[PDB]
Design a protein around this motif. Sequence first.
Motif, PDB file in Angstrom:
ATOM      1  N   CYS A 115       0.822  -1.209   0.000  1.00 34.56           N
ATOM      2  CA  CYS A 115       0.000   0.000   0.000  1.00 34.56           C
ATOM      3  C   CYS A 115       0.857   1.261   0.000  1.00 34.56           C
ATOM      4  CB  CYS A 115      -0.975  -0.032   1.181  1.00 34.56           C
ATOM      5  SG  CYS A 115      -2.167   1.307   1.223  1.00 34.56           S
ATOM      6  N   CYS A 171       2.277   1.483  -3.506  1.00 35.94           N
ATOM      7  CA  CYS A 171       1.265   1.827  -4.501  1.00 35.94           C
ATOM      8  C   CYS A 171       0.984   3.326  -4.507  1.00 35.94           C
ATOM      9  CB  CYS A 171      -0.020   1.040  -4.253  1.00 35.94           C
ATOM     10  SG  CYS A 171      -1.277   1.398  -5.486  1.00 35.94           S
ATOM     11  N   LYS A 172       0.799   3.931  -3.329  1.00 40.36           N
ATOM     12  CA  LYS A 172       0.524   5.368  -3.296  1.00 40.36           C
ATOM     13  C   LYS A 172       1.735   6.172  -3.743  1.00 40.36           C
ATOM     14  CE  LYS A 172      -3.229   5.699   0.061  1.00 40.36           C
ATOM     15  NZ  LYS A 172      -4.215   5.581  -1.049  1.00 40.36           N
ATOM     16  N   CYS A 231      -5.172   2.876  -6.154  1.00 38.86           N
ATOM     17  CA  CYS A 231      -4.748   1.872  -5.187  1.00 38.86           C
ATOM     18  C   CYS A 231      -5.957   1.248  -4.516  1.00 38.86           C
ATOM     19  CB  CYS A 231      -3.806   2.461  -4.134  1.00 38.86           C
ATOM     20  SG  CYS A 231      -2.233   3.060  -4.793  1.00 38.86           S
ATOM     21  N   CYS A 235      -6.532  -0.010   1.273  1.00 39.28           N
ATOM     22  CA  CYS A 235      -5.490   0.924   0.866  1.00 39.28           C
ATOM     23  C   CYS A 235      -6.071   2.273   0.466  1.00 39.28           C
ATOM     24  CB  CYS A 235      -4.659   0.336  -0.281  1.00 39.28           C
ATOM     25  SG  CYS A 235      -3.095   1.211  -0.595  1.00 39.28           S
TER      26      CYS A 235
END
Length: 528
Positions: free
Chosen positions: A6, A9-10, A74, A82
Amino acid sequence: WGNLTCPICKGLFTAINLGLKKEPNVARVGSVAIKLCNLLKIAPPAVCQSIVHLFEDDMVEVWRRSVLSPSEACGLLLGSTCGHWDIFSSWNISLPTVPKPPPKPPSPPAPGAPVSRILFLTDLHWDHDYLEGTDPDCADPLCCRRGSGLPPASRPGAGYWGEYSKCDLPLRTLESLLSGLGPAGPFDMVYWTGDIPAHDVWHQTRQDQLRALTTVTALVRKFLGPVPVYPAVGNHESTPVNSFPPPFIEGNHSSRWLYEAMAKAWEPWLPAEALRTLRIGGFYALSPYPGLRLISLNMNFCSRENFWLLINSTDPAGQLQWLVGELQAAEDRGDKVHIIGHIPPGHCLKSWSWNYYRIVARYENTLAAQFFGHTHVDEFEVFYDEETLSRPLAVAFLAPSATTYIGLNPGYRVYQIDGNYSGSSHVVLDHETYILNLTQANIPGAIPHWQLLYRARETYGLPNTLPTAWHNLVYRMRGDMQLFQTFWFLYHKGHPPSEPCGTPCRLATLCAQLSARADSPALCRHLM
Ligand SMILES: *[C@@H]1O[C@H](CO)[C@@H](O[C@@H]2O[C@H](CO)[C@@H](O)[C@H](O)[C@H]2NC(C)=O)[C@H](O)[C@H]1NC(C)=O
Ligand SMILES: *[C@@H]1O[C@H](CO)[C@@H](O[C@@H]2O[C@H](CO)[C@@H](O)[C@H](O)[C@H]2NC(C)=O)[C@H](O)[C@H]1NC(C)=O
Ligand SMILES: *[C@@H]1O[C@H](CO)[C@@H](O)[C@H](O)[C@H]1NC(C)=O
Ligand SMILES: *[C@@H]1O[C@H](CO)[C@@H](O)[C@H](O)[C@H]1NC(C)=O
Ligand SMILES: [Zn+2]
Ligand SMILES: [Zn+2]
């Protein structure tokens, strides 16, 4: 470890965001996008290039701020833990707690009662660059214009007044329409529901669109003089086409340039309180008569092609909640309501259309008439109760287009409406459609004669034009091929295609007449 997906991903999409703010990356998006446009032969390379350069700036920003926004992307990829993917999520407006009064059909008008005559104009699509004699079947999305080149010697070029192809209208053909209104008039008001620019959508500057607004506007004021005109906002008024950012987007890329220009071009027709709403989100209400409220809706906020709605599709501009407020206020006063708009409600995004359907059902006694365009063909949409989807309670008239696009005769529409007096139902009583038969208007040295094509009650044997009559017509047409062929003829303003509309074609066309709510197959359960 997994506990890092997570954060990573961000981190990726936050940098994705910042990368897409830089103009040379936007251009890079465009360069590959133009090459793919060429590989899939979507259009001639010149228009591929034009349309991508025109669209890329607003489009990359919309994607950056939605699909590729870290919270959303995400969410989609990693789930609720997430972020949160909510693109085109479902939403509901609030109906007031006032009890829904008992359903009451309109009373038949008393003998000799005032009848109001409304001229209905839609989808004018003036192509500034229309050029007589040019190729009607060119490789572009719009032909019969400057740059279409010449046709082969085997076929003739574009007729002087129009053509039966993917071609729009020269201004003179629009002028002829207004010049010939005399026999159809006089008129108490005009409803003008959008689409002023042509379909030249790969090269449209803001100045091209404003000239179209300013020019066509001045033309109807020249021919209708003192008669009030109430516009609605079409999908082609802006640039890029369908690009109508909701008021929560401010700055140069907002719709300020379009709505403000409309407010000054339409000031002689709309009061001051209405110009307020028009400037904000291109909709408004006013009172043509005592006892009647007219509401002009901006259907681009419901539209599946308005790519801005990817950022937030929830009741854009609060227009549906605003509509509820006005309809209730009308119910409180015993007023009736006319709704006008461009895209018909059945063609809207699912959530918008379902709330509109519920709103119509709630105010069935107060809504007297509904008018849309956009489809360019002559048709209608029936509304039913929410409880059983089987009692017809409203009908939207989808009037045909002034433009030929595509393959149609030019046409326009006139309504007889229960008139101006205390207690009037203000419902549509009948309507008529006028057309210009291009096959004879285009005879060299001919002077166009706009002819009456048909009168609704007369040709369909309707006893009135209340919702139940049109429901009955659809089911009559299911079992009467000759009667459906008449509807099919008039549907295309007198110039139907060569290919016969057989059994499947008929069912789909009949089904459309009953689908006032999008993505609701149940409405057609009795046809298939
Ligand atoms: C607002 O944004 C528009 C783009 O949508 C800018 O428009 C362009 O201006 C150049 C300058 O000559 C023209 O060549 C383009 O054809 C224009 N494009 C369109 C679509 O009209 C405009 O300049 C911007 N205005 C401000 C004040 O930033
Ligand atoms: C899109 O905009 C709507 C409002 O136009 C947002 O809905 C609001 O959300 C706030 C925060 O939870 C509430 O306090 C409001 O009452 C909501 N209004 C309505 C009409 O629902 C919605 O959250 C926005 N969506 C995104 C992703 O920003
Ligand atoms: C809207 O109402 C429907 C009921 O028809 C429901 O399924 C949905 O969850 C509601 N949405 C919200 C945000 O309340
Ligand atoms: C238009 O005119 C042509 C030529 O006379 C005719 O064949 C055709 O039937 C006419 N159609 C309509 C709808 O007027
Ligand atoms: Zn349209
Ligand atoms: Zn159109």
